[PDB]
Design a protein around this ligand. Structure first.
Ligand SMILES: *[C@@H]1O[C@H](CO)[C@@H](O[C@@H]2O[C@H](CO)[C@@H](O[C@@H]3O[C@H](CO[C@H]4O[C@H](CO)[C@@H](O)[C@H](O[C@H]5O[C@H](CO)[C@@H](O)[C@H](O)[C@@H]5O)[C@@H]4O)[C@@H](O)[C@H](O[C@@H]4O[C@H](CO)[C@@H](O)[C@H](O)[C@@H]4O)[C@@H]3O)[C@H](O)[C@H]2NC(C)=O)[C@H](O)[C@H]1NC(C)=O
Ligand SMILES: *[C@@H]1O[C@H](CO)[C@@H](O[C@@H]2O[C@H](CO)[C@@H](O[C@@H]3O[C@H](CO)[C@@H](O)[C@H](O[C@H]4O[C@H](CO)[C@@H](O)[C@H](O)[C@@H]4O)[C@@H]3O)[C@H](O)[C@H]2NC(C)=O)[C@H](O)[C@H]1NC(C)=O
Ligand SMILES: [O-][O-]
Ligand SMILES: [Cu+2]
Ligand SMILES: [Cu+2]
Ligand SMILES: [Cu+2]
Ligand SMILES: [Cu+2]
Length: 497
């Protein structure tokens, strides 16, 4: 795997991951983008080189490193017009950050418009040389990463605004459509008698996926970047941008077994081997599995996940019991999503730059209603009440700059102020849920908060949490090339975007 120091060269290319050629945004020649790897304590120097030529999929770009805190490097967080202006084609930009206090399973993706959908999305793993879970498995390497990607035959700008689901689901970059039921499937090799730490990464743009492996169970040991107490399951519903590590014990008979990743909409089920890949034991014939689906008897619920090392819930054990409660009221006008009456529109001057220039109060920050200012070292609680008014539910909400406690999950009326799982992406459920989260403001800067369905994000389903605006300038020392981005971008012709 490349990294922790590396060149990420962006180009446009024809790809056919599911048997059908279309143009894509690729990274060092491939989509999904390649695995970036390093270890706890590393310094990542990822030099993004923009050589994109296709305006329809955007020649400009910006890259987010999903799940990293970026403490004191808010400039590198990637999010376009919040954290930087876009990189222009013909240019480079070095993302330079440290990961001193974090390990686990992450990913990276374009954070401009719906560009990540057109192919700029890949896995990112930070290994812990003293992983507390290491005794549970034998093998954890580049070949134990499993990615899932909803794949479209029409490009994101050319297609529907809220598309009717994917054409294919890609498992490790490969899969089938109804029209291409003899395209190559991905194969994941195992050896009988060994235990694998599989790191499952959703690169999804919209649908969630219900993931299983015939004949096998999965012992979950990590949710997003957070180590969990081991939880054995046999089906996982993974929402856009979520991750899980799970241990698979490869001690079934030597055979081919179907790996299944069924989306809630699009092309559903398994006809012709769609939404499928192959788990192949060494020595088995190199042929499709003939295993059949078993009804799950131990599906994953977020309520059953708890952290491995105790992770104390900020604030006090009762609703609204924190320095700053917020409630996020979703709505939708048929075109744009709205949070507390406002649809995020990206500003010309990035929010960070606004703050550096001296804008530190919510009323002086543009766009007016979308930016909330938070005091430092303060406990926060945010509730995301699902509503008939925000269609496309369940919406998986993501907070940059933080992992957070999920005190109330989707499908639960219970509040857990004691030992809830922490993570960075959480499903806000269906009408009747009031999914609720907590975190401490210990990370000065402006951090995006949004639905990770990329079509909803591009339609304004976002706000910005500008924490500690007074110390934001001094804590986030900016490099000259970051300063150079906006003049270069603002100089561009509309057709060169
Ligand atoms: C920069 O990047 C962009 C984005 O990736 C690249 O865009 C590609 O642009 C080309 C055209 O320039 C485009 O091909 C065209 O696609 C349209 C749309 O197709 C859909 O239309 C219907 C959807 O509801 C549906 O009927 C249709 O289905 C059928 O299409 C063909 C049938 O033979 C089959 O392949 C397919 O399986 C299915 O049966 C599509 O889903 C299409 O209409 C175009 O064909 C046109 O037909 C009209 C009809 O009257 C004619 O008037 C036109 O003369 C024309 O023949 C054509 O196929 C790609 O779809 C775009 N790619 C993506 C991923 O969106 C762009 O190329 C790139 N630039 C460079 C320089 O590389
Ligand atoms: C999802 O969860 C959120 C967070 O819990 C929830 O928002 C909160 O709702 C409660 C009540 O529904 C709000 O609490 C109010 O606080 C003020 C006090 O300043 C008052 O309006 C109320 O206090 C009392 O009023 C009467 C006393 O005269 C009593 O008879 C009454 O019982 C109250 O105790 C009330 O407590 C709280 O302000 C919000 N938090 C926000 C908006 O940030 C939200 O409603 C939930 N959404 C869904 C759809 O379930
Ligand atoms: O994070 O998008
Ligand atoms: Cu993300
Ligand atoms: Cu993120
Ligand atoms: Cu959404
Ligand atoms: Cu984001």
């Amino acid at each position: 795997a490349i990294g922790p120091v590396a060149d990420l060269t962006l180009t446009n290319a024809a790809v056919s991951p599911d048997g059908f050629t279309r143009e894509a945004v690729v990274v060092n020649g491939i989509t999904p983008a390649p695995l970036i790897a390093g270890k706890k304590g590393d310094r990542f120097q990822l030099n993004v080189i923009d050589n994109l030529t296709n305006h329809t999929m955007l020649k400009t770009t910006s890259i987010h490193w999903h799940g990293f805190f970026q403490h004191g490097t808010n400039w590198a967080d990637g999010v376009s017009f919040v954290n930087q202006c876009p990189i222009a084609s013909g240019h480079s930009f070095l993302y330079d950050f440290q990961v001193p206090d974090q390990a686990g399973t992450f990913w990276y993706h374009s954070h401009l418009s719906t560009q990540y959908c057109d192919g700029l999305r890949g896995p990112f793993v930070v290994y812990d040389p003293n992983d507390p879970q290491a005794s549970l498995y034998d093998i954890d390497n580049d070949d134990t990463v499993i990615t899932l990607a909803d794949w479209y035959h029409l490009a994101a700008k050319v297609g529907q605004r809220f598309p009717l689901g994917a054409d294919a689901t890609l498992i490790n970059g490969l899969g089938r459509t109804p029209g291409t039921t003899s395209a190559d499937l991905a194969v994941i090799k195992v050896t009988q008698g060994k235990r694998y730490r599989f790191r499952l990464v959703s690169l999804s743009c919209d649908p969630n996926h219900t993931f299983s492996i015939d004949g096998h169970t999965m012992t979950i040991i990590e949710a997003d970047s957070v180590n969990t107490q081991p939880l054995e399951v046999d089906s996982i519903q993974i929402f856009a941008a979520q991750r899980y590590s799970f241990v698979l014990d490869a001690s079934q008979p030597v055979d081919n077994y179907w790996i299944r990743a069924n989306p809630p909409f699009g092309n559903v089920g398994f006809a012709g081997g769609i939404n499928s890949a192959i788990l192949r034991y060494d020595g088995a014939p190199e042929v499709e599995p003939t295993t059949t689906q078993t009804t799950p008897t131990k599906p994953l619920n977020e309520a059953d996940l708890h952290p491995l090392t105790p992770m104390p819930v900020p604030g006090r054990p009762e609703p609204g019991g924190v320095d700053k409660p917020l409630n996020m009221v979703f709505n939708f006008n048929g075109t744009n999503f709205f949070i507390n009456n406002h649809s995020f529109v990206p500003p010309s001057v990035p929010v960070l730059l606004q703050i550096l220039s001296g804008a530190q109060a919510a009323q002086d920050l543009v766009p007016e209603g979308s930016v909330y200012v938070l005091p430092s070292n303060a406990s926060i609680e945010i509730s995301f009440p699902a509503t008939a008014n925000a269609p496309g539910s369940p919406h998986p909400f993501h907070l940059h700059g933080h992992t957070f406690a999920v005190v109330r999950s989707a499908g639960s009326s219970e509040y857990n102020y004691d030992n809830p799982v922490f993570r960075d992406v959480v499903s806000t459920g269906t009408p009747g849920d009031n999914v609720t989260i907590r975190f401490q403001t210990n990370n000065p800067g402006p951090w995006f908060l949004h639905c990770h369905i990329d079509f909803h994000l591009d339609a304004g389903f976002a706000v910005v949490m500008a924490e500690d605006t007074p110390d934001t300038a001094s804590v986030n020392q900016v490099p000259q090339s970051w300063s150079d981005l906006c003049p270069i971008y603002d100089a561009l012709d509309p057709s060169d975007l």
